[PDB]
Amino acid sequence: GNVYGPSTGTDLFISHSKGVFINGCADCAIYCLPIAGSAFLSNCTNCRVYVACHQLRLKGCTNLDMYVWCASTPIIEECDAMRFGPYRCWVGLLSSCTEDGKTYATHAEWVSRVGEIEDTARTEQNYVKVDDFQWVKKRASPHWCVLAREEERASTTVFGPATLPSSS
């Protein structure tokens, strides 16, 4: 369970692990190698985040663009101005490597082999459905939406060096 942040204005590189917690980051891009477990973000604002994971939960976040490959539906809580896109927008992952130097040619391979999500076909599109569970009114939640094609930020950024966790 690696803990990262708080941090402002510096791009973060989160290596593969079985769980991450990201607290109090602002005004940056966050590039995560696939996490074979849950990712929890709290109190983050104005960040662009690229993450693959088994579960994704966000609390107290505002103006996050989330590029996500998740085995389950992402959950938000006390969040607003959230926009969701696919992990494949991190084009630079494909020119990156694992800690052991392994490289894969597609995002599905990365997510299957490093993320340990076996059913890549069924999960890729989980980012279009978000569970804003405290919004119990009948109408769609106004707190999140899906990024339009032209608003996708297709990052060519290569991973590394890994950001050192604050704790574990």
Numbering used by the authors: 158 to 325
Lines from the paper:
Tubulin-binding cofactor C stimulates GTPase activity and contributes to the release of the heterodimeric α/β-tubulin from a super-complex of tubulin monomers and two ancillary cofactors. There are five TBCs, termed A–E. TBCB and E bind α-tubulin whilst A and D interact with β-tubulin, to deliver each tubulin subunit into a super-complex comprising the α/β-tubulin heterodimer and cofactors D and E. TBCC is involved in the final stage activation of GTP hydrolysis by β-tubulin, promoting release of the α/β-tubulin heterodimer from the super-complex protein assembly that can then proceed to polymerization. This TBCC cofactor is a polypeptide of about 340 amino acids, located in the centrosome and predicted to form three distinct domains.
